[PDB]
Write a protein that binds this ligand. Structure first.
Ligand SMILES: N[C@@H](CCC(=O)N[C@@H](CS)C(=O)NCC(=O)O)C(=O)O
Ligand SMILES: N[C@@H](CCC(=O)N[C@@H](CS)C(=O)NCC(=O)O)C(=O)O
Lengths: 250, 251
């Protein structure tokens, strides 16, 4: 079979040109975990809309003014001749199109995952975003930097330099405390995956891991910031995240 | 099998002494759904702390003052001689202790349900509360009314009479729109239970149903407010809720 074409956002030498996006990483994870062959095409932030339109793909939401908003990840599957957008929809497509691969949406879990996904950004991803947003912008190629900084600063009404605070660190920890609580409901020995030790990795687990790999890559694995995040709750997150390192092929 | 003892909050003639609490209804639903025998013991709000302590039960949370906070539902199972508190825990206990009964927490769902349940009040339960809180209070016995009005008005900083607004109605509709979105992920034919048509009722489904039975009992099934609520999203919620009426036995 031909490699799926995977559209991702590039980076500069600060992070050695590593992919970095929490949103595209969900799909890089899905592909690596499923053992599917793919090739990465690199698209700068301001070129996303153009590229996706030229592919025949669709926007995934609308900006506050009401304009179509195009996002990555997007894939083109040469085996089905289909373009697929929106990370959750892409993961589901992968399950359905490649049924011999491990399922990210086991039967009976779709609505539960939809709900979990809907709260992952407010409770965890957004506070993390604030802690990594400046270093993210500085890891972008020049044209991406200008688009990202201008649009994100416009959005939050602050310079990117003002967003990371200790209050955001408290929000991250509080969000991870909630998550630890949910995982605790599975019982001892089953509290490192949402569906338990023998449940396997779901799309929802990947969503949490994608927040971690984002922070790790942007901050640096040898950094103190990374060490601070990963050390919370007595090293629980180091254990959780360590489950995903085998699936970080680039 | 001896009946489980089920501790619930009583009400006055306005709703013909019917059980009404969305919290105790989660366990009423669980017991009914599982077909377990039980009997209700009625406890007024200000008496809950003393009654649970006497049972040898435990508080379920901490008040901001760092004091113990006792809540219903609580059960006493004479078959195991166990007192169990906190509705989610009671439901889990019922799964484990009575394995022949239909599961409320299917294998692999515990954490997903914990997350869902944590979302349920802020997304949907709380705006429903604002629209039923006055009528709820006016359905309580006098000692319960006094305690409930005192504590809840202190909590929300307004008179109970001031809590229902159209903004709350909009928040209710928005909350249901989110839930409808989650259910749509299951696909047509599977979008009326969280785990789909063949997955069966979960504790999480019962949590949503408990908001509906609460409003129905408090408002009255013939009320225009009830008709307005279940007519949202082209009557989807009328269909969702109708699944549960077969489990609304009241001893
Ligand atoms: N709902 C989308 C969101 C993806 C998303 O926001 N991706 C970012 C990259 S991290 C993006 O392409 N933003 C487009 C822009 O800023 O114009 C998904 O999950 O795929
Ligand atoms: N977390 C508890 C909360 C139950 C709860 O808040 N029940 C209310 C009755 S609707 C209560 O006993 N509140 C006692 C009080 O306000 O003092 C549970 O889910 O069982």
């Amino acid at each position: 079979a031909q490699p799926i074409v995977f559209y991702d956002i590039p980076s500069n030498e600060r992070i050695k040109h590593s992919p970095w996006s929490p949103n595209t990483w969900k799909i890089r994870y899905a592909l690596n975990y499923k053992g599917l062959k793919y090739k990465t095409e690199w698209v700068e932030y301001p070129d996303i809309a153009g590229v996706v339109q030229k592919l025949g793909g669709k926007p995934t939401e609308k900006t506050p003014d009401g304009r179509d908003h195009y996002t990555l990840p997007v894939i083109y599957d040469p085996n089905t001749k289909k373009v697929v957008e929106d990370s959750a929809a892409i993961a589901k497509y992968l399950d359905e199109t490649y049924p011999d691969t491990p399922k990210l949406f086991p039967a009976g879990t779709d609505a539960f995952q939809a709900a979990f996904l809907d709260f992952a950004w407010p409770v965890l991803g957004f506070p993390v975003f604030m802690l990594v947003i400046l270093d993210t912008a500085n890891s972008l190629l020049p044209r991406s930097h200008d688009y990202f900084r201008s649009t994100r600063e416009q959005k939050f009404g602050k310079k990117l330099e003002e967003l990371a605070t200790e209050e955001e660190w408290a929000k991250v920890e509080a969000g991870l405390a909630k998550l630890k609580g949910y995982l605790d409901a599975n019982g001892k020995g089953n509290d490192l995956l949402l569906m338990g030790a023998q449940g396997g990795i779901t799309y929802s687990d990947i969503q949490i891991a994608s927040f971690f790999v984002w922070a790790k890559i942007i901050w640096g694995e040898g950094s103190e910031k990374w060490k601070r995040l990963i050390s919370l709750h007595d090293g629980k997150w180091a254990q959780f995240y360590a489950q995903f390192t085998k699936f970080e092929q680039v």
